[PDB]
Amino acid sequence: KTYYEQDANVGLLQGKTVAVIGYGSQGHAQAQNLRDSGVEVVVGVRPGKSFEVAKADGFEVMSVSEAVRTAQVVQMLLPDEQQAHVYKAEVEENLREGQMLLFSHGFNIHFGQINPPSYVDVAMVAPKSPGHLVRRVFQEPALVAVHQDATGTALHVALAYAKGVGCTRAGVIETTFQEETETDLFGEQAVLCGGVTALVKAGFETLTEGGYRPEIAYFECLHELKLIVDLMYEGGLTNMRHSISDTAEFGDYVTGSRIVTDETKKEMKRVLTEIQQGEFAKKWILENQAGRPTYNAMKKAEQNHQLEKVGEELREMM
Amino acid sequence: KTYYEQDANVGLLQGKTVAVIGYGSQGHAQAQNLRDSGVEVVVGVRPGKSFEVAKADGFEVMSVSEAVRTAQVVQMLLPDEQQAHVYKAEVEENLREGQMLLFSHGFNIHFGQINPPSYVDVAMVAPKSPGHLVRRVFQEPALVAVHQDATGTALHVALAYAKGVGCTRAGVIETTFQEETETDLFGEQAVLCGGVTALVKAGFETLTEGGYRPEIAYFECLHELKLIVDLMYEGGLTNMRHSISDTAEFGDYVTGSRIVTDETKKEMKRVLTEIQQGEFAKKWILENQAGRPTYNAMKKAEQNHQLEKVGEELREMM
Numbered sequence: 050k051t052y053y054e055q056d057a058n059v060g061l062l063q064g065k066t067v068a069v070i071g072y073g074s075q076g077h078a079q080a081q082n083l084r085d086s087g088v089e090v091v092v093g094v095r096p097g098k099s100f101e102v103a104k105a106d107g108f109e110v111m112s113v114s115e116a117v118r119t120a121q122v123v124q125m126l127l128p129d130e131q132q133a134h135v136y137k138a139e140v141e142e143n144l145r146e147g148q149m150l151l152f153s154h155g156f157n158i159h160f161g162q163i164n165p166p167s168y169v170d171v172a173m174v175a176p177k178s179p180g181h182l183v184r185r186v187f188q189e190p191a192l193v194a195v196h197q198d199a200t201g202t203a204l205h206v207a208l209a210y211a212k213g214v215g216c217t218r219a220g221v222i223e224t225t226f227q228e229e230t231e232t233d234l235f236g237e238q239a240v241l242c243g244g245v246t247a248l249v250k251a252g253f254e255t256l257t258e259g260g261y262r263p264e265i266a267y268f269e270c271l272h273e274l275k276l277i278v279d280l281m282y283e284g285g286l287t288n289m290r291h292s293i294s295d296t297a298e299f300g301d302y303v304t305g306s307r308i309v310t311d312e313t314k315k316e317m318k319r320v321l322t323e324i325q326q327g328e329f330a331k332k333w334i335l336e337n338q339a340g341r342p343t344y345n346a347m348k349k350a351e352q353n354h355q356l357e358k359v360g361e362e363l364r365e366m367m
Numbered sequence: 368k369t370y371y372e373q374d375a376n377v378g379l380l381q382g383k384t385v386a387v388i389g390y391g392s393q394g395h396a397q398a399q400n401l402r403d404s405g406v407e408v409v410v411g412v413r414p415g416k417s418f419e420v421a422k423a424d425g426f427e428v429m430s431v432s433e434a435v436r437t438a439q440v441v442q443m444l445l446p447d448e449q450q451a452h453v454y455k456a457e458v459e460e461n462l463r464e465g466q467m468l469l470f471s472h473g474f475n476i477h478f479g480q481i482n483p484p485s486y487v488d489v490a491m492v493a494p495k496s497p498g499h500l501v502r503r504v505f506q507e508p509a510l511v512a513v514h515q516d517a518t519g520t521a522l523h524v525a526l527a528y529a530k531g532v533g534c535t536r537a538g539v540i541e542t543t544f545q546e547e548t549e550t551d552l553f554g555e556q557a558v559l560c561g562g563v564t565a566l567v568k569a570g571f572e573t574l575t576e577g578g579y580r581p582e583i584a585y586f587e588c589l590h591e592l593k594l595i596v597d598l599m600y601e602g603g604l605t606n607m608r609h610s611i612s613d614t615a616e617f618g619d620y621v622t623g624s625r626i627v628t629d630e631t632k633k634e635m636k637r638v639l640t641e642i643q644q645g646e647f648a649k650k651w652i653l654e655n656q657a658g659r660p661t662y663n664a665m666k667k668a669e670q671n672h673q674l675e676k677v678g679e680e681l682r683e684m685m
């Protein structure tokens with residue numbers, strides 16, 4: 050079930066103020082994506098670089114408290130790990146009846162970090178592409194989930210935000226908060242971000258440990274990957290399989306099963322299971338409560354890897 | 368050591384005919400990339416779709432025999448597995464003194480499938496991006512290796528082909544036939560093509576087996592990957608790490624090491640070792656001698672996967 054442009058009409062927002070809370074990777078694009086489509090947008094963000102960048106973007110930047118007080122659609126675009134602190138201290142006491150409490154990721158609702166009152170709609174519009182892309186695509190996809198419907202229009206108000214940001218153009222698939230949260234987390238951990246970077250690093254290190262030039266390993270392990278995945282996007286694995294040599298495609302077939310075994314699949318099911326049982330959520334929540342001793346260290350190590358170091362010069366010249 | 372535009376001058380090709388043998392993924396782009404840069408190109412290909420597509424591209428399409436006879440630079444752009452059959456039956460007897468025998472992949476020279484005579488230069492220009500990209504980039508990278516220098520200019524004649532195709536613009540890194548062959552094969556088997564498709568499929572199947580909607584699994588496992596890798600290209604892992612949520616980056620750190628273990632690294636070293644010992648080459652060579660009973664079956668299975676099936680509708684609408 051996919052809602053499209055004919056399923057939505059932003060007219061439900063004519064005269065309705067959308068408070069974009071936060072102004073970062075998603076906050077800046079969606080606020081400017083609503084901007085063109087005649088959506089009256091007010092940005093609620095703490096003072097800082099987001100505050101003045103949204104100001105120079107021509108918006109009405111105010112505090113999170115004042116933004117909730119003067120809006121009917123509160124769109125939560127702070128970091129997932131900051132949303133509960135800001136909510137109870139600045140949003141909750143200012144929520145009124147019929148307001149929409151919107152998210153673009155279901156983490157804080159699904160794992161009980163934000164417990165909204167009963168007189169607001171709780172819905173989600175989760176775009177699949179990062180901000181900058183949502184911005185420029187509109188200037189010329191997403192999931193929708195309705196957690197709590199108090200007005201009877203939360204689905205159609207959320208599709209007016211989908212239409213306002215312009216996701217009904219490409220198309221919006223309906224899901225739930227649980228299903229979006231669980232699969233969004235699993236994808237970036239097991240495949241998109243955790244698996245691929247670990248796979249790129251392992252290949253790179255096998256070549257450098259094999260005596261091969263580090264700059265050569267950078268090309269065939271990381272740099273050629275963009276060209277490999279672009280073809281996958283346009284037409285799946287089949288298209289990418291056809292642009293590459295039969296020598297490459299045959300290597301794919303006989304080597305993929307060696308790299309990703311039945312044991313890798315069993316570990317992915319454990320990753321998924323820990324997501325479903327809130328165990329990852331707990332890990333990330335307590336991680337932030339502890340002052341990120343683990344996130345900061347591992348972030349610095351990943352940036353000190355030779356793949357990232359040798360990657361500097363290589364990208365400069367060309 | 369990187370040769371650049373100032374290191375090459377196509378003038379060594381003024382009045383020199385470059386015979387592009389084959390007209391496919393690489394043949395069409397390089398022949399048209401040389402075309403604009405005043406390079407006199409003659410295409411030598413068997414009759415068929417490549418023969419008439421090169422004809423409608425305005426070239427002088429002739430047989431492989433006649434192309435070698437009337438050219439001074441023979442560029443071998445047939446499939447790696449067809450080059451030895453075509454060579455001995457159509458190239459070898461027509462090679463003369465001072466001709467350049469060029470490749471864009473070192474497989475057939477490094478694994479002793481083509482044994483060139485002593486009176487020709489043997490060199491390589493291996494572009495890192497597939498054809499279509501080489502074409503349009505020139506209209507507005509590569510490795511260079513010199514296997515046999517008989518004229519004393521094979522390196523500078525090959526950089527005139529690099530300049531003629533336009534790789535000296537971005538830049539060309541010098542390698543050997545062995546090093547290009549070994550790492551090109553290892554990259555596509557362990558990382559780019561074999562590892563990633565196996566990793567995408569394993570994630571997708573974990574979600575579908577987990578009860579999740581197949582269309583939802585397509586987005587977070589395959590479709591979002593292009594947007595993930597694009598960021599990696601522009602600025603390494605660091606850049607991609609920053610566009611994604613801290614919730615995503617923290618998942619990366621704690622999950623990558625679970626998916627790609629010390630055991631995955633040991634298996635990659637076995638993949639590499641089998642490449643270095645000619646064992647993969649033998650496998651692929653005998654595979655083709657047998658009538659591809661293994662390549663065809665596995666190709667059909669990969670195209671019948673649900674990820675590719677569900678991928679159809681999803682890409683259509685948007």
Ligand SMILES: NC(=O)c1ccc[n+]([C@@H]2O[C@H](COP(=O)([O-])OP(=O)(O)OC[C@H]3O[C@@H](n4cnc5c(N)ncnc54)[C@H](OP(=O)(O)O)[C@@H]3O)[C@@H](O)[C@H]2O)c1
Nearest residue numbers: 071072073074075076095097099126127153154179611612
């Ligand atoms: N591409 C994605 O990463 C992606 C995909 C879909 C949906 N989402 C979801 O969208 C939401 C945010 O995504 P994001 O990646 O856009 O977050 P972001 O890029 O980190 O933007 C962060 C914003 O939060 C503000 N902020 C941080 N702490 C604050 C506080 N204590 N009080 C007030 N404002 C504060 C920052 O202002 P300063 O500049 O002052 O810190 C900045 O404007 C998350 O729920 C995320 O899961 C993101």
Ligand SMILES: NC(=O)c1ccc[n+]([C@@H]2O[C@H](COP(=O)([O-])OP(=O)(O)OC[C@H]3O[C@@H](n4cnc5c(N)ncnc54)[C@H](OP(=O)(O)O)[C@@H]3O)[C@@H](O)[C@H]2O)c1
Nearest residue numbers: 293294389390391392393394413415417444445471472497
């Ligand atoms: N992106 C890459 O795949 C890539 C990367 C760098 C370098 N290379 C290297 O470049 C070379 C070819 O790459 P490719 O991927 O361009 O090959 P390709 O796309 O398969 O092009 C195949 C060409 O070979 C011709 N051909 C096949 N069998 C023939 C025969 N028996 N006699 C004459 N012509 C024949 C085809 O003509 P029909 O249409 O008549 O079959 C077609 O023109 C290989 O050495 C490859 O490793 C490729």
